[PDB]
Design a binder for this molecule. Structure first.
Ligand SMILES: *[C@@H]1O[C@H](CO)[C@@H](O)[C@H](O)[C@H]1NC(C)=O
Ligand SMILES: *[C@@H]1O[C@H](CO)[C@@H](O)[C@H](O)[C@H]1NC(C)=O
Ligand SMILES: *[C@@H]1O[C@H](CO)[C@@H](O)[C@H](O)[C@H]1NC(C)=O
Ligand SMILES: *[C@@H]1O[C@H](CO)[C@@H](O)[C@H](O)[C@H]1NC(C)=O
Ligand SMILES: *[C@@H]1O[C@H](CO)[C@@H](O)[C@H](O)[C@H]1NC(C)=O
Ligand SMILES: *[C@@H]1O[C@H](CO)[C@@H](O)[C@H](O)[C@H]1NC(C)=O
Ligand SMILES: *[C@@H]1O[C@H](CO)[C@@H](O)[C@H](O)[C@H]1NC(C)=O
Ligand SMILES: *[C@@H]1O[C@H](CO)[C@@H](O)[C@H](O)[C@H]1NC(C)=O
Ligand SMILES: *[C@@H]1O[C@H](CO)[C@@H](O)[C@H](O)[C@H]1NC(C)=O
Lengths: 407, 117, 98, 98, 49
C-alpha cells in the first residue's frame, strides 16, 4: 500500500552450517610399475614411447602441492596461535561445543569429533601421500581462529589482537547489521539462550542427515572410485592375447610379442592419461572450493560481511570455523527479524511549514500518534528535532502528513 | 572352501593362494615399493642431502628416522620446532641448520599468544 | 542421432519465469527484507529512499525529485527493450554456449 | 588543485544489462550404440577394452545433474512465490516491461 | 578416442558454466536480494537495485 510498513518486534538468532571441500587426496604413480610391472621387455618399449611418464608425474606432483597450498590458504590465516582464557565465561554465550575439549585425546571439539566420525575416508604402483598438515595442526588453527574471534572480535584479522568483552562485540555486530546496542544489552539473556539452543541443535542436525556431509564423502568416494577403476584396468586385455605380460612373453615369439605388448602399453598409458586428466579437472574444482572457503574465512570469520547470503541466511552476525576431514564447516550465526507488525508510514512530517525527515529510522503511526522507529526493530520514540532534519519545504513532498515535532 | 584354490580382492588382484601339496592358505603381500625423494638445501649452500623413502618402513631399507611419510636417512630429529623450510610429510619439515647438518622437526604453527579477555 | 540424446531440463521455462516473477514481486513490495527473512512490505518510494541513503544521498533528494527519478527509470527501462532488440550480439554469450 | 573540488548538481538513473550463462544442454551418450551400433561382434570386442563406457556414463550424468543444480542455485533463492498486487501503482515507477 | 575427447571437452565446458552459474547466484543474492557496495559488481555506477 502507499502507507503500509511492516516493522519487526522480535528476533531469532539462527546458526546455519556450510560445508566446503578444501583438499583432495594426493596420489603418486610409478608409470613403469603400472604399465610394465617387473618386465624389462615392456620397459624397453615404454622408453621408446616417450616423455609421457614425466608429464604424468609432473601433473600429479603439481596436484599434490596444490592441495597442500589450498589447506594453508584456508587455515593458516592466523599469524599467531591464540588461546581461550582459562575461565570460560563469555557473557552467557556457551561455546563448549565449538571450543576444544581437553578431555578428548584428539583435542577436538564435540562438533569436530562428530564430523570426523561421520566421514571416515590396489598397490600396483599407486601411492597416497600424507598431507603436510596433520589433523591436529588443522584443529589447532581452528582453535586459534575461534579464540581470536571470541576474545578479540575482528581486530586480530586486521592487525594486533585487541581485547574486548563479548557482549560489546555482539553490540558492535548489531550496530553493523543496523540494530542499536540497547537492543542487545536489554535482551542479552534472550540472545544468549537463543545462541545456546541453536548451537545445541547444530549437532543433532548434523547427526540426523548424513547427506549434509555428503559433499566431503563424495570427494573421498570419487578418489576411491578413480583408483579402483585404474587397478581394474590392468585386468583388461586391450586387444592383446592376455592381460598378464608373462603369459604373452612365454606363449608367443618375441617379434609377435612386441605387437601385443605395444597394445597393452597403449591401453594402460591411455588409462593413466585419462586418470590424470580427470584428477586435473577435479583439482580445479577443489581449488575453486578452497578459494571460496578462504574468502569465507577472511570475510565471515575474521569480519562481518554485508554481502547478502554469503555468510548464512539472514543478517550476518558472526561465524565459527570447524575442521572436517578434507574440508571446513562454517557455523554462521545470523540475525532474523520476527513477529512483524503492520503500521502506517509517511515520508515526512510537516511542522511549522517545514518538512522533517528522520535521520535514522522511519515514521510510524499506531493509529493515533506518530513516532520514529529504527528499521529492523520496533523501538518507537517521540519525533523530535534531535532525530529529524528539516531539509526542505512542505509543498514538494508527496505523502507528507502534519504532526508536531517536540524540541 | 575345498574346491577353491585362489583368492582375489575387490580390485581383482590375487591376495591368497592354497599351497598345492599341503593344504595351507598363504596370503600374498606385494613386495615393498615406494618413491625416493632427495631433500636438498641449495647446491649453492651445501652438497649434503637426505633421502626419504615414501611409505617404506625403515626395516626394508647416517641417521635413520621413521615418520608417517616414510623413512628419512641423513637428517637428525630435533625436538625444538621451527617454521617449515622443506616439507616432508605429516607435520615433519626439514631444514639446513647449524657443526652444520640437516635437521627434521615437527613444524611450529606459530607463536603462542593468549589474549587477556 | 546415433545414441546421442538430449535430456530435458528439470525446470521448464514457465517455472523459471515464475521464480523470476517471485523475485521481482519480492524486491518491489518488500525491498531486501525477503532475502534475509520475512517479507516486510514497504512503500516503493520509501524503499528507493533507503537505497539512496545506502549510496550516500539523503532522502530529501529522492522525495523532492520523485517524478524526475520515476521518469528517468521509465525511460531507461524503455530503452533497454530497444537496446536488446537492435543488437543480437548482446545475447551472443548465451548463443555461443548453444 | 589542492583547494578545488567538484560536486555533482544532478543525477541520472541508468539501467544496464548483464547476461550470464547458467546451464548448458544435458547430453546422454550410449557407448555401445555409438561405437558398435547393433553388431554383437563389435560389442563383444569392445567389452575387452574395459570400463570406459561406464566412466563416460558417470561423467555425463554428473554434468546433467550439475546443470540442474546450477539452475536451482541461481533461480531458487526464495522459498515463497510472491505475487504483485493487482493495483500496479508503485509511486510512478512503471515495471510493465519486467 | 572420439568419445573420450568429447567427454573431456564437455567436462571443461561444464566447469566454465559452473563458474558462470556461481557468479550468477552471487549476483542474484547481492544485486537482487540486497544493495551492493562492491564497485562495478552490480552495473556501472552507484548500485541502487
Ligand atoms: C494510493 O494507492 C492507490 C492504488 O490504488 C493509487 O491509485 C493512489 O494514487 C495512491 N495515492 C497516492 C497519493 O499516490
Ligand atoms: C520474543 O520472543 C521470545 C521467545 O518466545 C519471548 O520470550 C519474548 O517475550 C519476545 N519479545 C517480545 C517483545 O514479546
Ligand atoms: C553449556 O555449558 C555447559 C557447561 O558449562 C555444558 O554442560 C552444556 O552442554 C552447554 N550447553 C550448550 C552448549 O548448549
Ligand atoms: C499509540 O501510542 C500512544 C503512546 O504510546 C498511546 O497513548 C496510544 O494509546 C496508542 N494507541 C493505540 C491504538 O495503541
Ligand atoms: C496538514 O496536512 C494535512 C494532510 O493533507 C492537510 O489536510 C492539512 O490541511 C494540513 N494543514 C495545514 C495547516 O496545512
Ligand atoms: C615398521 O616395523 C616395525 C617392526 O618392529 C613396527 O614396529 C613399526 O610399527 C613399523 N612401522 C610402520 C610405519 O609400519
Ligand atoms: C597548493 O600547492 C602549492 C604548491 O604548488 C602551494 O603554493 C599552495 O599554497 C597550495 N595551496 C593550498 C591551499 O595549500
Ligand atoms: C536534472 O536533469 C533533468 C533532466 O534529466 C532536468 O529536468 C533537471 O532540471 C536537472 N536539474 C538540475 C539541477 O539542473
Ligand atoms: C507503462 O508503460 C507502457 C508502455 O511501455 C504503457 O503502455 C503503460 O500505460 C505504462 N503504465 C502506466 C500505468 O501508465
Amino acid at each position: 500500500s502507499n502507507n503500509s510498513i511492516a516493522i519487526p518486534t522480535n528476533f531469532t538468532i539462527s546458526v546455519t552450517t556450510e560445508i566446503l571441500p578444501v583438499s583432495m587426496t594426493k596420489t603418486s604413480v610409478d608409470c613403469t610399475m603400472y604399465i610394465c610391472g617387473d618386465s624389462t621387455e615392456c620397459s624397453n618399449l615404454l622408453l621408446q614411447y616417450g616423455s609421457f611418464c614425466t608429464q604424468l608425474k609432473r601433473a600429479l606432483t603439481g596436484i599434490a602441492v596444490e592441495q597442500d597450498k589450498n589447506t594453508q590458504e584456508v587455515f593458516a590465516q592466523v599469524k599467531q596461535i591464540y588461546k581461550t582464557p582459562p575461565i570460560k565465561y563469555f557473557g552467557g554465550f556457551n561455546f563448549s561445543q565449538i571450543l576444544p575439549d581437553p578431555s578428548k585425546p584428539s583435542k577436538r571439539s564435540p562438533i569436530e569429533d562428530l564430523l570426523f566420525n561421520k566421514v571416515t575416508l590396489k598397490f600396483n604402483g599407486l601411492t597416497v601421500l600424507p598431507p603436510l598438515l596433520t589433523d591436529e595442526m588443522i584443529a589447532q588453527y581452528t582453535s586459534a581462529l575461534l579464540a581470536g574471534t571470541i576474545t578479540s572480535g575482528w581486530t586480530f584479522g586486521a592487525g594486533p589482537a585487541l581485547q574486548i568483552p563479548f557482549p560489546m562485540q555482539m553490540a558492535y555486530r548489531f550496530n553493523g547489521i543496523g540494530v542499536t546496542q540497547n537492543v542487545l544489552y536489554e535482551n542479552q539473556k534472550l540472545i544468549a539462550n537463543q545462541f545456546n539452543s541453536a548451537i545445541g541443535k547444530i549437532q543433532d542436525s548434523l547427526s540426523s542427515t548424513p547427506s549434509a556431509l555428503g559433499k566431503l564423502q563424495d570427494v573421498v568416494n570419487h578418489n576411491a572410485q578413480a583408483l579402483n577403476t585404474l587397478v581394474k584396468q590392468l585386468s583388461s586385455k586391450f586387444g592383446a592375447i592376455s592381460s598378464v605380460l608373462n603369459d604373452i612373453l612365454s606363449r608367443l615369439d618375441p617379434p609377435e610379442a612386441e605387437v601385443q605388448i605395444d597394445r597393452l602399453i597403449t591401453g594402460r598409458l591411455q588409462s593413466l592419461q585419462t586418470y590424470v586428466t580427470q584428477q586435473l579437472i577435479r583439482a580445479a574444482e577443489i581449488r575453486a572450493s578452497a578459494n571460496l572457503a578462504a574468502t569465507k574465512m577472511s570475510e565471515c570469520v575474521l569480519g562481518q560481511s554485508k554481502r547478502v547470503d554469503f555468510c548464512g541466511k539472514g543478517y550476518h552476525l558472526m561465524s565459527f570455523p570447524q575442521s572436517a576431514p578434507h574440508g571446513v564447516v562454517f557455523l554462521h550465526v545470523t540475525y532474523v527479524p520476527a513477529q512483524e507488525k503492520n503500521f502506517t508510514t509517511a515520508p515526512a512530517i510537516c511542522h511549522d511549514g517545514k518538512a522533517h525527515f528522520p535521520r535514522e529510522g522511519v515514521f510510524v503511526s499506531n493509529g493515533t500518534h506518530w513516532f520514529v522507529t529504527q528499521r529492523n526493530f520496533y523501538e518507537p520514540q517521540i519525533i523530535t528535532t534531535d532525530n529529524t532534519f528539516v531539509s526542505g519545504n512542505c509543498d514538494v513532498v508527496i505523502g507528507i502528513v502534519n504532526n508536531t515535532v517536540y524540541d | 572352501l575345498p574346491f577353491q584354490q585362489f583368492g582375489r580382492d575387490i580390485a581383482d588382484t590375487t591376495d591368497a593362494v592354497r599351497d598345492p601339496q599341503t593344504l595351507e592358505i598363504l596370503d600374498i603381500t606385494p613386495c615393498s615399493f615406494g618413491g625416493v625423494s632427495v631433500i636438498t638445501p641449495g647446491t649453492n649452500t651445501s652438497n649434503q642431502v637426505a633421502v626419504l623413502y615414501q611409505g617404506v618402513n625403515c626395516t626394508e631399507v647416517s641417521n635413520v628416522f621413521q615418520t608417517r611419510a616414510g623413512c628419512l636417512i641423513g637428517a637428525e630429529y630435533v625436538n625444538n620446532s621451527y617454521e617449515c623450510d622443506i616439507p616432508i610429510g605429516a607435520g615433519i619439515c626439514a631444514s639446513y641448520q647449524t657443526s652444520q647438518s640437516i635437521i627434521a622437526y615437527t613444524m611450529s604453527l606459530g607463536a603462542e599468544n593468549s589474549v587477556a579477555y
